[PDB]
């Protein structure tokens, strides 16, 4: 069964597909699954509570006795053929659930880092398929390395003290002089020649086997059909987490980047990854800024420490002299005004940094929507300045129009 | 217990749930249970020649070998893996294999059929 | 059965007594119901996020597919035989369930505004009975009922215009001079009696036949069954909040306050009453402060607007001149530091009010405890004075040493 | 693909794994059973 969420959303046991006791049991598994690799991805501000929380099953999803709920941890999850898809709440709409998985795919493009292609996503945009992002990842896992293998195979050389019928390559001669007479009839070289079956072929032949094998698509499976072909003389072996650190990336296999950080983001039971809808917005709204504010230079994780240190999202400063505090927060900013747990942290950041303090918030048809311009000015009574800046999300298309926008709200606000 | 189909429905009882978690060519074979004479060499066999086969081919998978004896949620008891208590740094379960002797052991070769 | 929790405390389903499905059941009429009636009781600084959270089968209980967790809500309820108590996290020990009832009850007792008398609560101690929220309120409104019914019964004063075959009270004229000679046989009088059943009577006869129906105690069934037996010719009423509110508490009835509000506080399916653990605490450190600072009155909940108005639990001011916040928070404090949520909140109630600030947190066994001064002076670069004190618990006790201790503390920060 | 247990090349084994999966078998036929197999591929 495929079942899909999105933030803070809710699904009905008796309107899900599948069995009731399956989906709880598929549950139970992936929350315990992330408190043991809970620890490898940062946070900010997310009020984790690590302690009770993540162990009690609420980790990823908050399973109850009437409903599934799903917490603000976005991304996906296959477990025990109950495949989990938890998309962010902003790209919900009012093929029909195929435009906020390109959104929130170039969302992990600008902000996680990754270096996939657009025409990558746009071959898929139209075909019909059903909607899943383990689907989508394998894909692009496995175009990009079928890109990456039909050029070059990434055959690499070993040098290999073999004993030889035939002479290649340079004949040792210590091995070769101290060669009894009875014996002599077989060269004794080391010949660097190139090998197919390297460690990153190694991976490659199990990370194509390990993704057909549980791939559901038409196009994934033709893909990865010609890919374990193309692999077909190489000994396979079981993936780990040592091998993947065992290869390094030089010149000779850099084109390789890209399909493997893909192969280790999906292998290394469970299958998929997760991270934080806060700090994902936060490493997002990063990439808008520093394009966005050519008159002064911003550092996202500045840290000062008041008395325990509270840090802002990021800030903005032209050299040393201005103090122009941007804390990103995922917050949906009810009612026009901020919270409570909000403006306490924006007193404190703009204090300890006549600091003008901006929060950059979501913007689209599902979120509270403001006006076009700095929608809400704010004193704290010490003679602060709160604006509330919005960033429309022209990111489920693939044109940056809201950019020019965002440009001209904080050019009045700078 | 008077079943003269027994060793026949062990095998099929382990095999059918062998090739359903693993591939076909991965099953037991029936040369390791063709000279057992007594319960004490079945003892042997099923100890020092078939379930080394099974941790052989289920390596860091505790659960699918659990569920290939149909032993799954049984532990500490007459189980042929028997529950470490200890849970590690980060989580893991981590059997330990047990060593039974005499009608125990029959006992828990009984509830595979 | 009977269950019981600890705030933030989680129980197995598969250790627990009844069946499985017998309590998840139960439980989802209670927070169902905590929904509806959610707004008659006042927060503090909850976060209770009215929208999503309490409509999710969250609201009181936390039901989950393994456990079962309890929320920050501390009281009781009875629902379905299955009776839930959650008692307070600060009076968990490390008869062995005895000692943190009598602790809750008292703690309820200063704060919430109850006149209870602990000798009602004395005479329970050591009587081995099974420990139980809902058998000993019943007792505290049976026993103050029939402390309260043994002097006098209440029999109050109405007038009725009743044709009488005798001659009682006043004679009525106009009604008599018209009356025809075929009907001068019966006199026609307006007679101030004594009614025994009155409105007050009607609701602590229903008061009592709904509590003896749903009693488990042999001390409650003996004390009610008195109580019916003093109320036998008084009509039955249904209960009802109108009945509840159609009498007034004038000098003659002064005396049945004390069973009247333990009798509204039990009655109005649901039974019991839920009141936050955050304010429950905010109340009662606000007993400790006014007793033990004399020097300076202290107000609670004044307000100062930001900018959404961030108001402390409780500020103490002198005439007007010394600003000394006061935020009752029940947070554990690890690590000997207040958290990111706390030490925020801490800067803008001392900026906005040079001025000091101190945070009053619990101290037991079960929670955290620091020294005997005060353990952490803090300052927020702004010249600031962040004071964690910290007050002992011998409210489990009947003695208040700990008082002694706190003053000593405060007058060291005043 | 909507076929099994019967005149089929591929059969399913009536006992599924632990997370839901399914194992099929090859299943030899003879005489008109395989032909009556080999008539429904067109």
Redesign the interface.
């Given at each position: 069964t495929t079942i899909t969420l999105y933030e803070?959303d809710?699904k009905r046991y008796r309107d899900i597909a599948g069995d009731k006791k399956?989906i709880?049991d598929a549950?139970?598994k992936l929350n315990?699954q992330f408190?043991?690799?809970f620890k490898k991805l940062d946070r900010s501000?997310d009020?984790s509570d690590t302690e009770?929380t993540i162990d009690?099953?609420?980790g990823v999803v908050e399973?109850?006795?009437?409903?599934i709920?799903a917490r603000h941890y976005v991304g996906f999850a296959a477990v025990?053929?109950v495949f989990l898809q938890i998309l962010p709440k902003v790209f919900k709409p009012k093929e029909d659930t195929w435009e906020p998985i390109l959104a929130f795919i170039r969302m992990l493009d600008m902000a996680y880092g990754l270096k996939i292609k657009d025409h990558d996503l746009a071959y898929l945009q139209g075909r019909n398929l059903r909607p899943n992002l383990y689907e989508v990842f394998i894909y692009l896992f496995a175009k990009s390395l079928w890109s990456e293998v039909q050029r070059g195979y990434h055959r690499e050389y070993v040098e290999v003290h073999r004993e030889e019928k035939f002479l290649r390559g340079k004949l040792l001669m210590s091995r070769q002089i101290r060669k009894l007479p009875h014996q002599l009839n077989t060269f004794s070289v080391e010949v660097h020649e190139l090998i197919e079956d390297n460690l990153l072929n190694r991976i490659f032949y199990a990370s194509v086997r390990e993704a057909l094998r549980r791939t559901t698509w038409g196009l994934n499976r033709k893909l990865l059909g010609e890919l374990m072909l193309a692999f077909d003389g190489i000994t396979p072996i079981?993936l780990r987490t040592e091998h993947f650190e065992r290869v390094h990336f030089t010149r000779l296999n850099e084109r390789f980047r890209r399909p493997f950080e893909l192969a280790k983001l999906l292998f290394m039971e469970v299958s998929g990854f997760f991270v934080d809808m806060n700090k994902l917005f936060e490493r997002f709204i990063e990439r808008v800024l520093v394009r966005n504010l050519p008159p002064e230079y911003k550092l996202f994780y500045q840290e000062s420490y008041?008395?325990?240190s509270?840090k802002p999202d990021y800030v903005v400063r032209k050299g040393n002299t201005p103090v122009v505090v941007l804390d990103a927060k995922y917050r949906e900013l009810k009612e026009r005004?901020?919270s409570?747990?909000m403006?306490?942290?924006l007193?404190?950041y703009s204090?300890?940094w006549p600091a003008v303090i901006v929060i950059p918030s979501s913007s689209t048809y599902n979120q509270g929507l403001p006006d076009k311009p700095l929608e809400f000015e704010?004193?704290?009574?010490?003679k602060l300045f709160?604006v509330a800046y919005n960033m429309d999300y022209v990111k489920t298309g693939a044109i940056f129009k809201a950019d020019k926008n965002f440009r001209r709200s904080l050019n009045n606000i700078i | 217990g008077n079943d003269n189909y027994f060793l026949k429905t062990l095998l099929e009882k382990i095999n059918v749930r062998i090739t359903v978690v693993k591939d076909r060519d991965h099953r037991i074979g029936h040369s390791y249970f063709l000279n057992v004479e007594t319960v004490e060499d079945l003892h042997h066999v099923w100890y020092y020649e078939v379930l080394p086969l099974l941790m052989e081919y289920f390596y860091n998978d505790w659960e699918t070998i659990k569920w290939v004896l149909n032993e799954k949620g049984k532990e500490h008891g007459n189980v042929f893996f028997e529950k470490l208590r200890l849970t590690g740094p980060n989580g893991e379960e981590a059997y330990q294999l047990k060593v039974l002797e005499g009608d125990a052991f029959i006992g828990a070769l009984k509830r595979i059929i």
């Open positions: 803070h809710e399956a709880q549950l139970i315990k408190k043991k690799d501000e009020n009770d009690e099953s609420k399973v109850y006795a009437n409903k709920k025990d053929n079981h008041p008395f325990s509270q005004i901020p409570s747990d403006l306490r942290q007193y404190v204090r300890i704010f004193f704290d009574e010490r709160i | -």
